[PDB]
Design a protein around this ligand. Structure first.
Ligand code: 3PE
Ligand code: 3PE
Ligand code: Y01
Ligand code: Y01
Ligand code: Y01
Ligand code: Y01
Ligand code: Y01
Ligand code: Y01
Ligand code: Y01
Ligand code: Y01
Ligand code: Y01
Ligand code: TOR
Ligand code: R16
Ligand code: R16
Ligand code: R16
Ligand code: R16
Ligand code: R16
Ligand code: R16
Ligand code: CA
Length: 1319
């Protein structure tokens, strides 16, 4: 079976690989055409197609046959299966052979599980095109570092699930149903019970869980799914509200806020940091520097070539008029005429709206033709007037020709199909980007476009892989859930029946927004909270490996193509401003640039205002005034508190004016903020004290000039010199991303204009689904669908987020960008028919293309462009210390913790008595520590084995297992105190943690039993935490999770003001919200509920956090708008029927801005952390950081136990000849290579020919990193003098005892431990 003379290996060749490539495309089309019907039903077309599967199976088994006979199978090394892709090729064809062997046995096996392998057939495209595999491998290569955030993530999910199991395990099963015996009612958002009982006339009956039983903490598997849902931030507030109802709203915020902060924000920070480190380390590989230099050289060629092409300045009608054309048609007044007339074109097509006055329709009708013809003329004048042959040589010239032909297309197609007019003539607004040519920002952007246009075969071949995996997951979802979504309510819009509706729900699940509800449908599809929950695993493996592989793809693209355009533009100013300006006669280098370059290298009276207690005693008043803002009651206008705080308002404005006046005295004429606040306070006080009446509706005047008070916290920014510095960092980041913010705004405007042309006037609907016009939608109608059959009135409405004016298009596209509620906008956009006609379900299903090209551009591409610009260009915060430690920088400087790490164990009993070497022995030499890690790994299981409604003995089984594990752990505790000593035990920061946990568990076991009455107004539940903290003991045996956590928490401790700006943002907006929307009448039908309201400071803080985490903020914005009801206020006799205006239309500004500020101020806090640890995140095995450097302590303590000496020299080559080679020799290099390393290390001697600890430490450090070392002689000592000067320059706190130790001064006369075996 090794028969040579194959003759089939020559058939694996040019043509029979381009036929397999076509059979696969045909097969993918066939799998696309299929439609899945609910119960054994089949469309005629699907029966038609089911008669092609044998053809494809035949061709694929033929491929297996020819490849197998022309190669080996397994035993041959280069055989068939030894390829990685051929094994899955073979599995797919195997299942093709098997699944078509059903009729023979009538499928008595009842597989229902083998044609689901067919969905892997699209991946055979990757197998057939290696140009796609070598992109896929690169992508999968960038995600290997992530498999420690995942373990960090799954730990957090587990740690918060255990806790959930303790606290909400069975407490979500009673709901408040209307008494109404027989027909129980309940709410539409069901209201749970607890000791918090039913409100008015409802009774507390049984209930399956919240989402038909799916969103509860019953098992551990139900808790690690609810908590995974909350971490993805989808519907985490519904869970928070359920547990608030079911238990009481006082402690639940402690579980769900740190679950979102730790699990959802901190994990984004880790993932961004890890990926950015990986991108810095991957841009410098040789095969990537090579392909970048190939781009920089070609940019040099073109840059000089255009300058040379400027030297072509040559000075009957073939030359008589065609000389003046090309003159004028390139003059600087012509560019400006064209660019000031395209700016009229894009203002003409941006004023179209719905119901535009009938004169505008005709005026703009003439305008399209006028401008189109004018651009035809001033395009031909470039083509017939300068030459078609050399016409396509400018990029935007090709682009303008394309837009002109497209506009001609649009005119014709509007003529022959009136209606849809998607109007590609706003694309000419792209020419406005040419305006940048007149600024200094042209290079930064032309280089970006050059770096994008070069790397386009690798962006397309990468979007194509995203598309293949979406197709595979769409077909898999069709298999699992195809036609099973026909519920008795009606099939949802997020189907899996047909292909265009499976693609657009896999797209939701990737963009991860409302994957919640799709998963609930896909669970009740296959059963319920029952046999059906095994399919919560398609929506987890697609909302994880999608929310993360799509930020590693779109961040790789945007960091690569933007670090390229930053290094391309650093080599213009480094030539045109540093080469010619010299030969024709650091320096603000960001953190990323530094790191990647390092990798590639491998009146008189008042002036006594100043009292040391004036600029610090006004700060206290600012703080007290800010806090007093928080305690206003928004609703009870004339309560006790509001009067007390009004007197405080007098006090505070008095202080602020008495200091503003003296400041203006000493300063004459950030302070404008002080001025505005004091002027507003004075004006409000004056015109409220004076009359208050006799001016039209001027209660709101004082109410609105008291919103200016919220600026009082802002006054601190100038006072605190470091808060001011962080604020300025935020502003300079905003200025960095401002040439791209404008390109973003321009592209978003173009999409908004297109969306207005496409959906204007079409977002209307009658409240009665049968009528579909404003003429018909009048009267009353019986509503059966509420299942109450009640007579309502027909109203003709718009949808709330429509696209009938460019302002409304911009707002409802911003809503799509933030992600919230875009599935509903897509649902409205497909169900669209004609102007002023009502919807028709899943009509015009192609308007979903607009909503994927949108996502590929704005939420995926530009947002990652912004993250990458802020990462790449981030300046070190404080660097004004002699050019940033000119000679010893991050890795050099920080590796000098040799001033530390002197100590060693010092824990051995050193008594050799009994217990001294008995217990402290037993403890060491694992036969005890392994057995105790086993008890940790089993106590982690008895915490996962809680569940609700257990049999009985299982419950006691758990109690006694807990007792046994607590007994073993308390034996841990008092078996190391007496083995390590009382003082030594409480000093390792993990022993005290274990002690706290064992004490907590012991007291829990005591308290839950008798001999202490469980009264005196105190609750014992929190002690369960001490039992669930034992799972943290699994983290101790980490050291790769622990290093990340320590590294990223340290850099949170070094930015105490970056997360004070976010607290101040939240404070300012919470106070504004309380003032403005504080007295909206709560309505459970709206989103100003009893849960979600601005009624209190902490309620508004929760509302703002809910919105920041992107949780239906759009509907809070809509339910805060004008004309809403109002609270009774129970303190006034007037304004009962009136002041039915207690909303406001500033909600749009209030929520569109916060979402832009909180999403920006968080980005900074992310980058400010990432760039803090950029040395850890770009650490490498080649390049030393402290990561390798602590191994030296281990090898020292074990192999030497020197204690400042006690080495002589044997320990040296007893050290270096074994341990890993970032420090030098290593095991495989005990040769003359080691000899020539040692001859570079030279350092003095001691009593027994010995040396010091840290002297050797610097010896290894400098001999590896090359930190100021010569080849010998007094040369190395003068270099050492330089090094000593540098060390004193960094650290003055080193005494000459320790300093001389670090600069051991090996004079030439004094022989070394290095020049002993050398000579
Ligand atoms: C960092 C991570 C922090 C994670 C903290 C998680 C704590 C979650 C506690 C949710 C409690 C919600 C609530 O209001 O529950 C009230 C409940 C009433 O008791 P009941 O539910 O009837 O159960 C009695 C069992 N003997 O009584 C309770 O359950 C009270 C629980 C009090 C918890 C106090 C936590 C203090 C801070 C701990 C930081 C760690
Ligand atoms: C490694 C980590 C994962 C380990 C997985 C281990 C799986 C073990 C399976 C045991 C099966 C036990 C069994 O038959 O349970 C039946 C039970 C019936 O549940 P039922 O009464 O219908 O509703 C309960 C509502 N709390 O079924 C249940 O209680 C529900 C079973 C599914 C639980 C939810 C799973 C969701 C996905 C979790 C992904 C992680
Ligand atoms: C220079 C370019 C890029 C921007 C120019 C701005 C316009 C595109 C914006 C500015 C304000 C907008 C207007 C703001 C308010 C309205 C009223 C509103 O129409 C109605 O009141 C409906 C009933 C009616 O037409 O009488 C929506 C269209 C319109 C004119 C908007 C159309 C688009 C306008 C003119
Ligand atoms: C949380 C505190 C310690 C932060 C620092 C600010 C405090 C020094 C002061 C500044 C203004 C003070 C407030 C000014 C006025 C009032 C009204 C005063 O009267 C009532 O509300 C009594 C109502 C009742 O009897 O129930 C109660 C304290 C309170 C809220 C004060 C609480 C303490 C505040 C916030
Ligand atoms: C400004 C930069 C980002 C250029 C990229 C934008 C355009 C290339 C995109 C924006 C939205 C897209 C459009 C949005 C949705 C549709 C509707 C879809 O259905 C139709 O309108 C045609 C059939 C019909 O409805 O009669 C056809 C593709 C089209 C025009 C899309 C084609 C590509 C468009 C114009
Ligand atoms: C019985 C199990 C299935 C219940 C749940 C606990 C597990 C997650 C246990 C099973 C065995 C345990 C492991 C047994 C031995 C080791 C080796 C050791 O791993 C190290 O990182 C060692 C130090 C190093 O080499 O850096 C200590 C942790 C670990 C992985 C243990 C971690 C916890 C594990 C994986
Ligand atoms: C890595 C390994 C060790 C996973 C850990 C296994 C156990 C710690 C977990 C995983 C599966 C869990 C089980 C999944 C489902 C069920 C069925 C369910 O029991 C019922 O019949 C409940 C009925 C009801 O609640 O009305 C809840 C307990 C139990 C056995 C769970 C108990 C805890 C189990 C065994
Ligand atoms: C070593 C630690 C970390 C885990 C040990 C797990 C198993 C060895 C044991 C411990 C408790 C046992 C459970 C204790 C009680 C019950 C209830 C029992 O059902 C009854 O109602 C009991 C009827 C009877 O026997 O009288 C069925 C077995 C079961 C689930 C046992 C199954 C086996 C379990 C899980
Ligand atoms: C019971 C199942 C369902 C989950 C149990 C909890 C896991 C999330 C925990 C238990 C043990 C933990 C592991 C214990 C030890 C290690 C080895 C450790 O690896 C290293 O640090 C590499 C060695 C080195 O470089 O020092 C860190 C990850 C890991 C797998 C830990 C990851 C998190 C684990 C798997
Ligand atoms: C559920 C998760 C998110 C919380 C777990 C707590 C961690 C944030 C903290 C708690 C205790 C910390 C540990 C406490 C002490 C040390 C020793 C310390 O060691 C070093 O400085 C480096 C090694 C050396 O040079 O000796 C810093 C890492 C480590 C393991 C810390 C790592 C980060 C830990 C695990
Ligand atoms: C990244 C972090 C460390 C920066 C600083 C914190 C901020 C992100 C802010 C914004 C959201 C704030 C939280 C928003 C919501 C709440 C609930 C709020 O709840 C209550 O006081 C009562 C219960 C209820 O909310 O109904 C208490 C403040 C708190 C935790 C806030 C604490 C401070 C937070 C986390
Ligand atoms: C680490 C980093 C930034 O991401 C990798 C890898 C090599 O370059 C990538 C970047 O994507 S692209 N098409 O803009 O070149 O291109 C591919 C080949 C897709 O892989 C990309 O660089
Ligand atoms: C040796 C190079 C190839 C590495 C092994 C094959 C990888 C590709 C096959 C598996 C792809 C994922 C299949 C599961 C569904 C997404
Ligand atoms: C490598 C594991 C990543 C995290 C998976 C979490 C799944 C929770 C359900
Ligand atoms: C030679 C062209 C000069 C262009 C100057 C402005 C460029 C602005 C950045 C363009 C980014 C395009 C991204 C489009 C969406 C994928
Ligand atoms: C009254 C019509 C709606 C007003 C909406 C205000 C905000 C508009 C811009 C939204 C963000 C665009 C980027
Ligand atoms: C990623 C690109 C594909 C996007 C798929 C969704 C749009 C599908 C457009 C064609 C819709 C045809 C509907 C036929 C009847 C269901
Ligand atoms: C009916 C309760 C079953 C519990 C099963 C626990 C299995 C633990 C294995 C380790
Ligand atoms: Ca959401």
């Amino acid at each position: 079976n090794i028969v040579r003379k194959y003759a089939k290996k020559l058939i694996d060749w040019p043509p029979f690989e381009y036929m397999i490539l076509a059979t696969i495309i045909a097969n993918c089309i066939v799998l696309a055409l299929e439609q899945h019907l609910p119960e054994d039903d089949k469309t005629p077309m699907s029966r038609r197609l089911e008669k092609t599967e044998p053809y494809f199976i035949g061709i694929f088994c033929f491929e297996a046959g020819i490849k197998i006979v022309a190669l080996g199978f397994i035993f041959h090394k280069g055989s068939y299966l030894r390829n990685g892709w051929n094994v899955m090729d073979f599995i797919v064809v195997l299942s093709g052979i098997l699944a078509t062997a059903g009729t023979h046995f009538n499928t008595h096996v009842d597989l229902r599980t083998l044609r689901a392998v067919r969905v892997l057939r699209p991946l055979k495209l990757v197998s057939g095109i290696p140009s796609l595999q070598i992109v896929l491998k690169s992508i999968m290569k960038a995600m290997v570092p992530l498999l420690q955030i995942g373990l960090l993530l799954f730990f957090a999910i587990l740690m918060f699930a255990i806790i959930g199991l303790e606290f909400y395990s069975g407490k979500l099963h009673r709901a408040c149903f209307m008494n109404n015996s027989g027909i129980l009612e309940g709410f539409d958002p069901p209201h749970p019970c607890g000791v918090q009982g039913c409100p008015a006339g409802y009774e507390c009956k049984d209930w399956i869980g919240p989402n038909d039983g799916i969103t509860q903490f019953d098992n551990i598997l139900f808790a690690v799914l609810t908590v995974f849902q909350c971490i993805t931030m989808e519907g985490w507030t519904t869970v928070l509200y359920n547990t608030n109802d079911a238990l009481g709203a006082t402690w639940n915020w402690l579980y769900f806020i740190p679950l979102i902060i730790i699990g959802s924000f901190f994990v984004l920070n880790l993932v961004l940091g890890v990926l950015s480190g990986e991108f810095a380390k991957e841009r410098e590989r040789v095969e990537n520097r090579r392909a970048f230099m190939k781009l920089r050289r070609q940019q040099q060629i073109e840059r000089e070539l255009n300058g040379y092409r400027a030297w072509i300045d040559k000075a009957h009608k073939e030359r008589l008029l065609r000389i003046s054309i090309r003159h004028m048609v390139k003059s600087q007044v012509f560019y400006w005429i064209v660019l000031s007339l395209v700016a009229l074109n894009t203002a003409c097509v941006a004023i179209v709206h719905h119901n535009q006055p009938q004169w505008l329709t005709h005026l703009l009708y003439y305008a399209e033709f006028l401008f189109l013809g004018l651009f035809l003329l001033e395009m031909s004048l470039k083509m017939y007037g300068m030459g078609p042959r050399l016409y396509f040589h400018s990029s935007f010239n090709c682009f303008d020709f394309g837009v002109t032909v497209g506009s001609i297309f649009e005119v014709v197609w509007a003529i022959f199909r009136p209606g849809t007019s998607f109007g590609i003539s706003v694309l000419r607004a792209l020419r406005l980007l040419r305006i940048f040519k007149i600024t200094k920002y042209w290079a930064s952007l032309r280089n970006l476009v050059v770096s994008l246009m070069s790397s386009m075969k690798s962006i397309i071949s990468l979007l194509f892989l995203l598309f293949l995996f979406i197709v595979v997951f769409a077909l898999l979802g069709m298999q699992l859930f195809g036609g099973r979504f026909n519920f008795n309510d009606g099939t949802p819009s997020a189907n899996f029946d047909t292909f265009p509706a499976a693609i657009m729900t896999v797209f939701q699940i990737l963009t991860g927004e409302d994957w919640n509800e799709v998963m609930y449908n896909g669970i009740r599809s296959q059963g319920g909270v029952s046999s059906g929950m095994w399919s919560a695993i398609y929506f987890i493996v697609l909302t994880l490996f999608g929310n993360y592989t799509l930020l590693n793809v779109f961040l790789a693209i945007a960091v690569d193509n933007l670090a390229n355009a930053q290094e391309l533009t650093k080599d213009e100013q480094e030539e045109e401003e540093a080469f010619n300006q010299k030969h024709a006669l650091r320096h603000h280098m960001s953190v990323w640039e530094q790191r990647t370059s390092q990798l590639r290298k491998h009146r008189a009276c008042h002036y006594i205002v100043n009292l040391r207690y004036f600029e610090m005693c006004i700060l206290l008043v600012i703080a007290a005034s800010s806090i007093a803002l928080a305690a206003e009651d928004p609703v009870l206008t004339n309560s006790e508190r509001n009067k007390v705080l009004r007197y405080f308002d007098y006090v505070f404005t008095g202080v602020f004016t008495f200091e503003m006046v003296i400041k203006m005295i000493d300063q004459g004429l950030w302070n404008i903020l002080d001025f505005v606040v004091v002027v507003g306070a004075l004006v409000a006080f004056a015109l409220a004290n004076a009359l208050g009446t006799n001016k039209g509706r001027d209660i709101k005047t004082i109410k609105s000039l008291r919103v200016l008070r919220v600026l009082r916290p802002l006054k601190t920014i100038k006072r605190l010199p470091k808060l001011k510095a962080v604020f300025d960092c935020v502003v300079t980041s905003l200025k960095n991303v401002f040439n791209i913010l404008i390109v973003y705004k321009l592209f978003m405007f173009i999409f908004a204009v297109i969306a207005v042309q496409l959906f204007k006037g079409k977002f209307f609907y009658c409240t009665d689904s049968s009528k579909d016009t404003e003429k018909e939608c009048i009267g009353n109608y019986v509503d059966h669908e509420k299942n109450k059959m009640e007579v309502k009135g027909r109203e003709w409405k718009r949808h709330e987020f429509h696209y009938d004016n460019i302002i409304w298009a911009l707002l409802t596209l911003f809503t799509v960008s933030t992600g919230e509620g875009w599935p509903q906008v897509l649902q409205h956009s497909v169900d669209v028919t004609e102007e002023d006609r009502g919807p028709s379900r899943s009509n015009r299903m192609e308007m979903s293309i607009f909503y994927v090209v949108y996502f590929v551009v704005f939420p995926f591409f530009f947002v990652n462009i912004f993250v990458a610009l802020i990462i790449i260009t981030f300046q070190e915060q404080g660097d004004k210390m002699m050019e940033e430690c000119s000679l010893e920088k991050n890795e050099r400087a920080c590796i000098d913790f040799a001033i530390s790490a002197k100590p060693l164990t010092r824990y051995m009993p050193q008594n050799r008595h009994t217990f001294q070497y008995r217990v402290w022995h037993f403890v060491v030499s694992p036969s005890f520590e392994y057995t105790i890690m086993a008890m940790i790994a089993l106590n982690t299981v008895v915490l996962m084995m809680k569940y609700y409604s257990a049999p009985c003995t299982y419950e006691l089984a758990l109690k006694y297992l807990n007792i046994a594990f607590t007994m073993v752990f308390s034996l841990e505790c008092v078996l190391k105190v007496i083995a390590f000593g009382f003082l030594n035990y409480f000093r390792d920061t993990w022993n005290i943690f274990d002690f706290i946990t064992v004490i907590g568990s012991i007291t829990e076991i005591i308290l839950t039993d008798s001999k202490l009455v469980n009264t005196s107004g105190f609750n014992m539940s929190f002690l369960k935490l001490f039992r669930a903290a034992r799972l943290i003991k699994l983290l101790r045996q980490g050291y790769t999770i622990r290093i990340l956590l320590w590294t990223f928490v340290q850099s949170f401790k070094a930015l105490p003001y970056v997360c004070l700006l976010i607290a101040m943002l939240f404070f300012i907006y919470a106070i504004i919200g309380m003032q403005v929307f504080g007295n909206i009448k709560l309505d459970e039908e709206s989103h100003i509920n009893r849960h979600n309201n601005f009624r209190s400071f902490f309620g508004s803080l929760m509302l703002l956090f809910r919105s920041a985490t992107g949780e239906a903020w759009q509907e809070i914005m809509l339910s805060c708008l004008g004309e809403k009801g109002c609270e009774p206020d129970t303190t006034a006799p007037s304004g009962q029927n009136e002041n039915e205006r207690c909303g406001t239309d500033l909600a749009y500004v209030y929520f569109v801005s916060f979402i832009f500020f909180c999403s920006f101020l968080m980005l900074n806090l992310f980058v400010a952390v990432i760039m803090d640890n950029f040395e850890y995140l770009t650490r490498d095995s080649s390049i030393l950081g402290p990561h390798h450097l602590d191994e030296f302590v281990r090898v020292w303590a074990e192999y030497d136990r020197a204690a400042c000496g006690r080495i002589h020299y044997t320990e040296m080559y007893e050290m270096l000849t074994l341990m890993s080679p970032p420090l030098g020799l290593g095991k495989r290099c005990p040769s003359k290579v080691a000899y020539k390393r040692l001859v570079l290390m030279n350092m003095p001697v001691a009593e027994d020919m010995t040396v010091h600890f840290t002297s050797t430490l610097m010896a290894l450090i400098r001999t590896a990193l090359d930190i100021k070392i010569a080849k010998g002689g007094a040369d190395r000592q003068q270099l050492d003098s330089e090094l000593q000067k540098e060390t004193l320059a960094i650290w003055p706190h080193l005494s000459q005892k320790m300093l001389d130790l670090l600069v051991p001064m090996p004079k030439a006369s004094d022989l070394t431990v290095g020049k002993i075996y050398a000579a």
